Design a protein around this ligand. Structure first.
Ligand SMILES: C[C@H]1O[C@H](O[C@H]2[C@H](O)[C@@H](O)[C@@H](O[C@@H]3C(CO)=C[C@H](N[C@H]4[C@H](O)[C@@H](O)[C@@H](O[C@H]5[C@H](O)[C@@H](O)[C@H](O)O[C@@H]5CO)O[C@@H]4C)[C@H](O)[C@H]3O)O[C@@H]2CO)[C@H](O)[C@@H](O)[C@@H]1O
Ligand SMILES: [Ca+2]
Ligand SMILES: [Cl-]
Length: 496
């Protein structure tokens, strides 16, 4: 469950947050495939409750009503079509599996669901599955409120309601079977793996029990005996009875300390500086590289939800964000996930964004199509960070240097650092308040290389900065502290 199952030489996956299936299918063919993206993490494909107050928030999708593949992103056929077209071009699909709970115990009963299925939170009747009162942890939870009140209590974290969401009795074979049934339907359609939502709130053993019931990946696209890639969402900063290591047996785990610490460093807060990244990785107390799924920001924390806090870098802090994402993609630690967002009317009141609930771009609840502008950027309020030249080219940088060791590290003792990856790539950063201008050892073969951050190598020339590597691998780099992008990256495939 540790291998992502991506095509050889594809090292990253993108979270196309809240996108429609039909748009993801097109994106796979027109962009993801040709630009070397390994895969896509899609929003929960199963039916959820339609919440009208506030108006269709992004978070209604983490409140299941049934396992019917019918959401605002599309119906079953559209989902199947997407998986097929994507797989046919070598881009994998990873499904966000919401299996720890159903909806909020306080939502009104009826048919306010994306597929019209009837549900009754009050009586715990989810007839579409079906689940009944006998399938929840109500009798297990021992908190007054029936909700998680103490995170220092591991049993509470697992048997009580997270924020009031109806907690499933995952120790029951019937429940395990229903979930495995849903997951197997997805596996057969062709999905390569899953993001297990709220894994901290489930016992490692129940997760194991469900995984034992899964089929191998679809043999039309994957080698026989292929197991789905599993990455579990466990928010594990220090200080909790539940450790992320408790989940290594089931697959990889989200390393939330990664983006939290990288943000503090790039923002130069808490006395942190880029020269301290010389031993980045496990040296920073992170999980083994072979069990990590890393990212700068995710859908929850780029909003204030989840964990990370103010240090988290987002598309809103574009300049520092491109640098952080670039550092992530150049560094060999972990398996990288890139984020792709939509803009919302962020409105802070007392340090809180009162509009943090705002869902994807829509016309009376109907998600707007992703439009592509003449310059390849997206329209209709979709950010498309994955299309930003500096990010997409770094996604390619990672593919090119895959397998090469971290070498030729340089630092000025402050915020000017550089490092290479074998003889295949070299990157330089200037996050100090003065200009960088130095001749460095790159470990690369002599030649003219196009800087992939300022431009592209197009038909024998570069559209941006050109770097000249001498016979001894030395190259001069100049970066003004006032540069749009204070970092340069060159690799084996950007060489003229
Ligand atoms: C009934 C309630 O419905 C709505 O709740 C929504 C949340 O507001 C929203 O974040 C979104 O969240 C998703 C869910 C739910 O499926 C789980 C994931 N992230 C979780 C994480 O798994 C949890 O562990 C937790 O994290 C804790 C850490 O564990 C803890 O260590 C740290 O210190 O604190 C955090 C919490 O601050 O919460 C994370 C968000 C998914 O990734 C995430 O997308 O969906 C729910 C459901 O709609 C509504 O907003 C509430 O008001 C209602 O009470
Ligand atoms: Ca649980
Ligand atoms: Cl995540």
């Amino acid at each position: 469950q540790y291998s992502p199952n991506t095509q050889q030489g594809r090292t990253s996956i993108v979270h196309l947050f809240e996108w429609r299936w039909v748009d993801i299918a097109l994106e796979c063919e027109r962009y993801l495939a040709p630009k070397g993206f390994g895969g896509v993490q899609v929003s929960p494909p199963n039916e959820n409750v339609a919440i009208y107050n506030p108006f269709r928030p992004w978070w209604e999708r983490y409140q299941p009503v049934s396992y019917k593949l019918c959401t605002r992103s599309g119906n079953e056929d559209e989902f199947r079509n997407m998986v097929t077209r994507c797989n046919n071009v070598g881009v994998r699909i990873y499904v966000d599996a919401v299996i720890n709970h159903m909806c909020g115990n306080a939502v009104s009963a009826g048919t306010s669901s994306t597929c019209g299925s009837y549900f009754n939170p009050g009586s715990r009747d989810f007839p579409a599955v079906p689940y009944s009162g006998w399938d929840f942890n109500d009798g297990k939870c021992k908190t007054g409120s029936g909700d998680i009140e103490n995170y220092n209590d591991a049993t509470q974290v697992r048997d009580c309601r997270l924020t009031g969401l109806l907690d499933l009795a995952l120790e029951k074979d019937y429940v395990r079977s229903k979930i495995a049934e849903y997951m197997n339907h997805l596996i057969d359609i062709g999905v390569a793996g899953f993001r297990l939502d709220a894994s901290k709130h489930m016992w490692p053993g129940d997760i194991k029990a469900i995984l034992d019931k899964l089929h191998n990946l679809n043999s039309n696209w994957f080698p026989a005996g292929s197991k789905p890639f599993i990455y579990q969402e466990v928010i594990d900063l220090g200080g909790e009875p539940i450790k992320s290591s408790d989940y290594f047996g089931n697959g990889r785990v989200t390393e939330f300390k990664y983006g939290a610490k990288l943000g503090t460093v790039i923002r130069k807060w808490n006395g942190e500086k880029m020269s301290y990244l010389k031993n980045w990785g496990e040296g920073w107390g992170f999980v083994p590289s072979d069990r990590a799924l890393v990212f700068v920001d995710n859908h929850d924390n780029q909003r204030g939800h989840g964990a990370g806090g103010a240090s988290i870098l987002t598309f809103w802090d574009a300049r520092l964000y491109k640098m952080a994402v670039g550092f992530m993609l150049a560094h060999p630690y972990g398996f990288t996930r890139v984020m792709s967002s939509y803009r919302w009317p962020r409105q802070f009141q007392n340090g809180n964004d009162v509009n943090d609930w705002v869902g994807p771009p829509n016309n009376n609840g109907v998600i707007k199509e992703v439009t592509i502008n003449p310059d390849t950027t997206c329209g209709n309020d979709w950010v498309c960070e994955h299309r930003w030249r500096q990010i997409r080219n770094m996604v390619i940088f990672r593919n090119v240097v895959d397998g090469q060791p971290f070498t030729n590290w340089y630092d000025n003792g402050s915020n000017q650092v550089a490092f290479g990856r074998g003889n295949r790539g070299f990157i330089v950063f200037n996050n100090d308040d003065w200009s960088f201008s130095l001749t460095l050892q790159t470990g690369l073969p002599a030649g003219t290389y196009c800087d992939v951050i300022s431009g592209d190598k197009i038909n024998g020339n570069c559209t941006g900065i050109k770097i000249y590597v001498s016979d001894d691998g030395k190259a001069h780099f100049s970066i003004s502290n006032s540069a749009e992008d204070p970092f340069i990256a060159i690799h084996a495939e950007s060489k003229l």
